[PDB]
């Protein structure tokens, strides 16, 4: 484990989370921070000067402790380690067929991020959109099929990351024990939802009396698990106020095996679609979006700039396990 990379990605996950909640503080949230970190790190491979340092600092790296090369190497090592359960991540670039790219960039993009270069006729707008969405559908096994909605005819490249996850609970719920039960959207508003249940369960457990929340971990068959954080009623805002790498680590470190009388978990499926421009600007990635953008590591010229960053993610939780998928796309016209 490169501890430096692991730390940066967790910090970036909680910064992103807070910004996503700031948009609409009472709505469902689902995203893949790993997908977004990897897509932006891929982008930084082609960046120089202030454009580059802003991306890498935005991703929460300390450029003083680590070099650009070591960061790309850490992501290469991460991607190889990730790809029992089903898990895959992919990177791609879709490039205007005539656009001249540096050999060193396409070679490095393939070697470090596993990325191919797809020739694409962006002026045939609808066919380019179908080529990209098809790539994402394939990578996500049909879970994400409309990441690209609009696509300007003068786009020069689109960088794409996807992640697909499908795992079985090692202690699965029995659908015979799924019953409609109340879910309290607030203290005074509640609806009936399908509520799964498990009886007499020994799982890692931690009651945080100071933060008024209960933490449990449900393992999947692989090396992956789901950490669930359940704030007491009306304590969600309080618990969100403490979220950080340090707090999450303290949560994991405080888990102990404990026999649960019963566990009730809703069966649910949620989906969210985000434009990340405002959030990336807030996190300090600014020059990439302006005419001062320096993506000359891609083409040999300061001729490219980012116009749009979008992210789509889905999460399905059911008796047998969990399915989750996400994709990130970066739209890059001429500067």
């Amino acid at each position: 484990v490169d501890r430096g990379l692991a730390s940066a990605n967790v910090d970036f996950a909680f910064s992103l989370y807070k910004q996503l909640v700031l948009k609409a503080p009472d709505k469902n949230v689902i995203f893949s921070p790993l997908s977004i970190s990897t897509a932006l790190a891929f982008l930084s491979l082609g960046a120089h000067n202030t454009t580059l340092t802003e991306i890498l600092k935005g991703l929460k790296f300390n450029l003083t402790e680590t070099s650009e090369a070591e960061i790309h190497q850490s992501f290469q090592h991460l991607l190889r380690t990730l790809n029992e359960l089903q898990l895959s991540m992919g990177n791609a670039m879709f490039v205007k067929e005539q656009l001249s790219l540096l050999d060193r960039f396409t070679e490095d993009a393939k070697r470090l991020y596993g990325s191919e270069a797809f020739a694409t006729d962006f002026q045939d707008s609808a066919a380019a959109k179908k080529l990209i969405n098809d790539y994402v559908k394939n990578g996500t096994r049909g879970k994400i099929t409309d990441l690209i909605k609009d696509l300007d005819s003068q786009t020069m490249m689109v960088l794409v990351n996807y992640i697909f996850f499908k795992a079985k609970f090692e202690m699965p719920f029995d659908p015979q024990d799924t019953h409609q039960s109340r879910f309290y959207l607030s203290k005074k508003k509640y609806v009936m939802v399908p509520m799964m249940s498990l009886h007499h369960l020994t799982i890692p457990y931690f009651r945080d009396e100071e933060l008024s929340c209960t933490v449990v971990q449900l393992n999947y068959t692989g090396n992956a698990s789901a950490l669930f954080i359940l704030p007491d009623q009306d304590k969600m805002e309080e618990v969100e106020a403490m979220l950080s790498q340090e707090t999450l680590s303290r949560f994991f470190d405080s888990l102990e095996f404990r026999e649960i009388g019963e566990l009730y978990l809703p069966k649910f499926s949620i989906s969210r679609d985000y434009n990340l421009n405002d959030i990336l600007l807030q996190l300090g990635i600014e020059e990439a979006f302006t005419s001062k953008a320096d993506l000359s590591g891609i083409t040999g010229a300061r001729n490219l700039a980012v116009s749009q960053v979008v992210h789509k993610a889905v999460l399905d939780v059911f008796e047998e396990g969990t399915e989750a998928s996400a994709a990130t796309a970066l739209f890059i016209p001429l500067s």
């Binding site: 990605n9 992103l16 469902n28 893949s32 790993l34 879910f183 449990v216 669930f228 009388g261 649910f268």
Partner: protein, 33 residues
């Protein structure tokens, strides 16, 4: 004797122990979408 009832908004974080990566982060405020 303990009962854990996810009948109110909660967070779910899918993690990989080998790499210490967060794959997905989620807040469920309404499971009826």
């Amino acid at each position: 004797r303990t009962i854990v009832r996810f009948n109110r908004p909660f967070l779910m974080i899918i993690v990989d122990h080998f790499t210490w990566s967060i794959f997905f982060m989620s807040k469920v405020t309404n499971p009826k979408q």
